[PDB]
């Protein structure tokens, strides 16, 4: 069962999230994403520090990034 | 063909290391590793096909990974070979790891961009060209994400570990491989990328000229591995969906196995083991 969308304004941009398995998007680009075996997720600008959701890894590409735009 | 402690590097082999990866950085191959490397960390996955992490042949598909770049640094200078970093004994930013001679330190504050050493943007010798997000400088904040880098008796507990892998062979599975990998355990190789930050904790590691240094020890750690286990070897041995067994031949190379890549002698030997 995948986990809920969500869709919020963390440090002023926009980070969405749906089911596909699931997709992430800070300000409309998207922002690959994978899930781990024990449920936890990484994304392609954290790859290597698990996070428990896919929020929390939208909320910590938006930490990195420090407002520069995903490719 | 003798890979030692960067800490133990004299000057010329220090500027002869540095210039041999800023000429393959110039040539456009360097940027191929980086996208090589980013296409198998975001395409292997613990419930599909994984081969170069979180799965066994993590190690040797790093192993040979590792030796497609020394041997293109090679092509440049013969007497250049990767040298390795002890995180578990060089673990401040005062390392001379991290000195202007070598690979510059961390990123300023405000944007994370390291100001100093050979790769920093101002020199204009170190663009970064293949990413995930628009900056093209190189980023670092040694310690900022993760306060500690692995110690040596975390690093001996690892060590410990008799069983090379373990089903299910992904992220989840106990054994050698994982723990030394980091996704179980006290995290040795996934804390390091944490701890440096910037490109270091992305798909495109290999944008940091340390990522070298980093898994060249992470090699040189299976190497004691197999010296303190002996009747251990690598697994599975045959016959697994989607993972690479023993004499199964490994991409993107795809004329070579793990098998082909156990014993590091065959290409090249440490300072000391
Ligand atoms: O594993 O990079
Ligand atoms: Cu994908
Ligand atoms: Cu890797
Ligand atoms: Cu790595
Ligand atoms: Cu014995």
Not at chain 2, 145 to 153: C, F, W, Y
Not at chain 2, 192 to 218: C, E, I, K, R
Request: hydrophobic share 35%.
């Amino acid at each position: 069962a995948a986990p809920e969308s969500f869709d919020e304004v963390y440090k002023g941009r926009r980070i969405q999230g749906r089911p596909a398995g699931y997709e992430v998007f800070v300000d409309g680009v998207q922002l690959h994403v994978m899930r781990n075996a024990d449920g936890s997720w990484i994304s392609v600008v954290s790859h290597y520090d698990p996070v428990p959701t896919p929020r929390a890894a939208a909320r910590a590409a938006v930490d990195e990034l420090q407002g520069a735009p995903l490719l | 063909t003798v890979r030692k402690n960067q800490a133990t590097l004299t000057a010329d082999e220090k500027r002869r290391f540095v210039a041999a990866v800023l000429e393959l950085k110039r040539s456009g191959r360097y940027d191929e590793f980086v996208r090589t490397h980013n296409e198998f960390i975001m395409s292997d996955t613990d419930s599909g096909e994984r081969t170069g992490h979180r799965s066994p042949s993590f190690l040797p598909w790093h192993r040979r990974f590792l030796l497609d770049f020394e041997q293109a640094l090679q092509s440049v200078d013969s007497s250049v070979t990767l040298p390795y970093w002890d995180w578990s004994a060089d673990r401040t930013v005062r390392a001379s790891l991290w000195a202007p001679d070598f690979l510059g330190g961390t990123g300023r504050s405000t944007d994370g961009r390291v100001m100093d050493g050979p790769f920093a943007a101002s020199t204009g010798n170190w663009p970064i060209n293949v990413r995930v997000d628009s900056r093209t400088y190189l980023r670092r904040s040694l310690g900022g994400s993760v306060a500690e880098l692995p110690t040596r008796a975390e690093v001996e507990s690892v060590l410990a570990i008799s069983a090379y892998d373990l089903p299910p062979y992904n992220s989840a599975s106990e054994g050698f491989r994982n723990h030394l990998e980091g996704w179980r355990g006290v995290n040795l190789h996934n804390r390091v990328h944490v701890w440096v930050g910037g490109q270091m904790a992305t798909g495109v590691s290999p944008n940091d000229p340390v990522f070298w240094l980093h898994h060249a020890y992470v090699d040189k750690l299976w190497a004691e591995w197999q010296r303190r286990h002996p009747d251990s070897a690598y697994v599975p041995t045959g016959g697994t969906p989607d993972v690479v067994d023993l004499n199964e031949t490994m991409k993107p190379w795809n004329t070579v196995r793990p098998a082909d890549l156990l014993d590091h002698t065959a290409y090249y030997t440490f300072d000391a083991l």
